[PDB]
Amino acid sequence: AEEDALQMAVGYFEKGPIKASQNKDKTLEKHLKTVENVAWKNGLASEEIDILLNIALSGKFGNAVNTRILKCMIPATVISEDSVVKAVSWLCVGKCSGSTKVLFYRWLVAMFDFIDRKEQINLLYGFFF
DNA sequence: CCGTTTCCAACGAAGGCCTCAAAGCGGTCCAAATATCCACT
Structure with missing residues (x-):
């Protein structure tokens, strides 16, 4: 149906931006x-969460595109800890803007109890402080 | 024997604290402009 279209969309997200077309x-x-629709009707799986978070926090698609990726982030399943660790590392890189950082922090505060493991999150207390 | 310097008894206000009542509105919730901004071209 449309799941192959979703896989093609995340693959294109993995490719990168476009210049001329x-x-x-x-x-x-x-x-x-399509991603917003599937996230509203049933949500998203745990395999693409890491990829979409890394793409949004990398800073390749611009702020206007990364602003809605965090909004459409609907964790239908449990969130892995390595994805949050990679997101914290990408935040520590410094390529992000202020609005996307505020959005990511609000999302992490709202989706705190949806994470399975929380010991490696507490192991990163200094980077948050 | 008598005047003068000095410590002692004492009224006071003086300040410091406590309590109550009355006038005010800052804070919380909420509208719809509107203006900050980030990169649009």
Whole structure:
């Protein structure tokens, strides 16, 4: 049905941005529409959470695109700890802006109890302090 | 024997603290402009 389209969308997210074909930007916008729809009806799995978080916090698609990826982040399943560790490392890199950092922190505060393990999160107390 | 310096008894206000009542609105919830901004071209 559309799950193959979702896999193609996350693969295209893995490729990177585009320079000349700005209509392919509207195609990936349709892809984001599909991701939002599937996240609203049933959510997202745990395998793409790490990839989408790393792509959003890497800073390759611009702020206007990364602003809605965090909004459409709906953890239908449990969240892994290595994904949060990689997200904290990408925040410590410093390529992000202020709005995306605020959004990520609000999302982590809202989705705190949806994480399975919390000992490696406490093991990163200094980076948060 | 008498005037003068000095310690002692004493009224006071003086300050410091406590309590109550009354006038005020800052804080909380909430509207719809609107203006900060980030990169749009």
